[PDB]
């Protein structure tokens, strides 16, 4: 199947099953990464190289005052990617336990986290003209195709001048694959590009993550605005 409408028989249960899953996951890096904590540094290093280009190379350079971490969990990305590069960071996540642990996990640099929003992305509206970078990693599979498009549109309205949205996620080989355990979908490159392009966002960069374990789905980063 090629859409969520086909693989998601009950949209209400698609969301409630995912909320239930994450509510009893340990608030640790291994919990965030499904046992793949050993690739966290490899992931963060590529994300930094991918992002530093928009921040260093003009013209129309991306600012460094504020970033939003979407589906942030305990702040794995906020801690090692975003806080070293942006003056302040906002986090949003559906799981209360992760936002609470983030205060401890982030340590002293976590004092630069401005807001800990507790919300599903499908219900979340980032404030207009607020963010230089909106980072969306390993969470787009928890939204339906339509909710993802609408969320990206709301994100576009919250970007400051020259700001970007970044999506980094697993890509399926073909079509849309449903994961029954965590209640998320995996989409192929064509589906994701169509959702993005079809929602009114411009695709600026696209990069496959190298050096990942052989056994996992491929991971891609997209920069959009």
């Amino acid at each position: 199947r090629g859409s969520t409408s086909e693989v998601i028989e009950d949209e209400k249960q698609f969301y409630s099953k995912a909320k239930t899953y994450w509510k009893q996951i340990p608030p640790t890096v291994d919990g965030m990464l499904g046992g793949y904590g050993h690739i966290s540094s490899i992931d963060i290093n590529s994300s930094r190289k991918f992002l530093q280009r928009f921040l260093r190379e003009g013209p129309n350079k991306t600012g460094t005052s504020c970033a939003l971490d979407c589906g942030a969990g305990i702040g794995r990305i906020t801690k090692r990617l975003l806080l070293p590069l942006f003056r302040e960071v906002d986090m949003v996540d559906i799981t209360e336990d992760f936002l609470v642990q983030a205060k401890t996990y982030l340590g002293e640099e976590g004092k630069r986290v401005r807001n800990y929003f507790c919300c599903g992305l499908q219900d979340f509206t980032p404030e207009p003209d607020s963010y230089d970078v909106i980072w969306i990693q390993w969470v787009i599979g928890h939204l339906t195709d339509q909710h993802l498009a609408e969320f990206l549109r709301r994100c576009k309205g919250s970007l400051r001048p020259n700001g970007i949205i970044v999506i980094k996620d697993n890509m399926a080989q073909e079509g849309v694959i449903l994961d029954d355990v965590d209640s998320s979908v995996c989409r192929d490159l064509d589906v994701v590009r169509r959702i993005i392009c079809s929602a009114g966002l411009s695709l600026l960069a696209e990069e496959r993550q190298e050096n990942l374990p052989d056994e996992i789905y491929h991971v891609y980063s997209f920069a959009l605005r």
């Binding site: 793949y36 994961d179 789905y217």
Partner: peptide, 6 residues
């Protein structure tokens, strides 16, 4: 997060 190809 990262996942084994099912």
């Amino acid at each position: 997060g990262p996942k084994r190809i099912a």
